[PDB]
């Protein structure tokens, strides 16, 4: 279980906030890149934001993506969106959290 990661984020995304999301990976050596993205829930159909982050020994394999939920791109209407998918994708893993 050498190859591991943490993505850490605010407990709640504020609508329209600029949120800074930071990733650390451990036990990699080859410089590789990931994308961190915010996607509609549950369908994951609409990306509210995405950030390419390069991770390297040069960065000590750490970076942050700055991501914002622009208020107009939420569907709004009668039901506010309550939940959203934070996603990470890399050559080595993908996970998403509500």
């Amino acid at each position: 279980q050498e190859q591991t990661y943490v993505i850490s984020a605010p407990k709640i995304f504020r609508v329209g906030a600029s949120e800074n999301i930071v990733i650390q990976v451990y036990g990699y050596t080859e410089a590789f890149d990931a994308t961190i993205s915010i996607k509609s829930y549950p369908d994951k159909k609409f990306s509210y934001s995405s950030g390419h982050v390069h991770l390297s020994s040069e960065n000590k394999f750490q970076n942050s993506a700055i991501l914002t939920i622009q208020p107009k791109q939420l569907p709004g209407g009668q039901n506010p969106v309550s939940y959203v998918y934070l996603e990470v994708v890399s050559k080595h893993f993908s996970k998403s959290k509500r």
């Binding site: 279980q1 050498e2 591991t4 943490v6 650390q24 451990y26 036990g27």
Partner: protein, 57 residues
């Protein structure tokens, strides 16, 4: 011995702020996330610090 957190308390911290530290250690074969956090009061100094005074005191 590990580098201390030598940092300026930047002006965006002036409302009482918070710090969290962590590492992952891979163990023998099993990883564990280890972390700790602390509260940091930053003394409420404004950014503008607008000073207004009656000159004919």
């Amino acid at each position: 011995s590990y580098q201390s957190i030598n940092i300026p308390v930047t002006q965006n911290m002036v409302p009482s702020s918070r710090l969290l530290v962590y590492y992952i250690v891979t163990g023998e074969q099993t990883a564990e996330l280890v972390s700790d956090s602390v509260w940091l009061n930053i003394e409420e100094k404004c950014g503008n610090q607008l000073q207004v005074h009656l000159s004919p005191d």
